[PDB]
Design a protein around this nucleic acid. Structure first.
Ligand SMILES: *C[C@@](*)(O)[C@H](CCCNC(N)=[NH2+])NC(=O)[C@@H]1CCCN1C(=O)[C@H](N)Cc1ccccc1
Ligand SMILES: [K+]
Ligand code: NA
Lengths: 27, 251
DNA sequence: GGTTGGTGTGGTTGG
């Protein structure tokens, strides 16, 4: 289903204020 | 949550508050994993050393929330529990091994912009995300500091997963494969931790492969909160997934 | 206030 995809973020193509910090940690 | 910040609206739509019927009080966090199932820490429900032993009728859940104590008219949804399942090998005597419980809602909850389930990891997602130095995110309405206080809205902090030998060396309490630890090292120059009242809430990670949020951990225990050289301990969701699947399949 | 603060031509929502 669409588990894990937030109506007000991923579904609207909007990023929250700190998720980039998580993405960066994988670098 | 210590040294975190206020959540944005809808940032954590799987966040669940566990609430005692009377006296009315916030007990714990929890997370929504389908329209009918909510995951939490077992110690939120059963902890004999503190005289806690709640069943279904003692409790309700509140889903969709942002304010800690205000009833958010037309946004939040309240569910009674049909049944509670605590992991049969939950060890409250010693180290909270297997600190995990499932609560089945009496009726499915309707999803909204504020209410939406998180994913559980499969073997591959867990192998690739659950690595030392990768960051996940913890959320809760628990204490802002060790007491030895309460936020007015949901708090969020991002924290790196810590190497198992560093976790093990930080405490005398016996660490198992059913736990992992997260938090900055003393010298790392950032801070943050979960705290009392945050138990049951999710440690989540955003997959860089499919853009979905996965719940990797449950806030479980710590010694103090945000101390230098200590780390927060989290129930390892993927390791207990055979039990989660067994209960949802059977019930 | 209220299943609920402090302010709303509401807000993450009426009157
Ligand atoms: C019930 C939860 O709110 C709380 C979360 C604590 C998270 N702390 C940090 N720093 N991230 N868990 C607890 O309070 C658990 C329940 C029982 C006592 N406890 C502890 O964390 C003790 N401080 C340590 C402990 C005692 C006995 C067994 C295991 C751990
Ligand atoms: K009002
Ligand atoms: Na620390």
């Amino acid at each position: 289903a669409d588990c894990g995809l937030r109506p007000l973020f991923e579904k609207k193509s909007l990023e929250d204020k700190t998720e980039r910090e998580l993405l960066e940690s994988y670098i | 949550i210590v040294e975190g910040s206020d959540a944005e609206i809808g940032m954590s739509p799987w966040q669940v508050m566990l609430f005692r019927k009377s006296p009315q009080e916030l007990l714990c966090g929890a997370s929504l994993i389908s329209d009918r199932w909510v995951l939490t820490a077992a110690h939120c429900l059963l902890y004999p050393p503190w005289d806690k032993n709640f069943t279904e009728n003692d409790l309700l859940v509140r889903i969709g929330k942002h304010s800690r104590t205000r009833y958010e008219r037309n946004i939040e949804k309240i569910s009674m529990l049909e049944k509670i399942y605590i992991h049969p090998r939950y060890n409250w005597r010693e180290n909270l091994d297997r600190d995990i419980a499932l609560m089945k809602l009496k009726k499915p909850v309707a999803f909204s912009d504020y209410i939406h389930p998180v994913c559980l990891p499969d073997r591959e997602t867990a192998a690739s995300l659950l690595q030392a130095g990768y960051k996940g995110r913890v959320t809760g309405w628990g204490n802002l500091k060790e007491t030895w206080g309460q936020p007015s809205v949901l708090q969020v902090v991002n924290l790196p997963i810590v190497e198992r030998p560093v976790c093990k060396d930080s405490t005398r309490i016996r660490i198992t494969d059913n736990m992992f630890c997260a938090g900055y090292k003393p010298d790392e120059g950032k801070r943050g931790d979960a705290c009392e009242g945050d138990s049951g809430g999710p440690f989540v990670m955003k997959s860089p492969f499919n853009n979905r949020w996965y719940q990797m951990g449950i806030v479980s225990w710590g010694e103090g909160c945000d101390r230098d050289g200590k780390y927060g301990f989290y129930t390892h969701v993927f390791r207990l997934k055979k039990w989660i699947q067994k209960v949802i399949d059977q019930f």
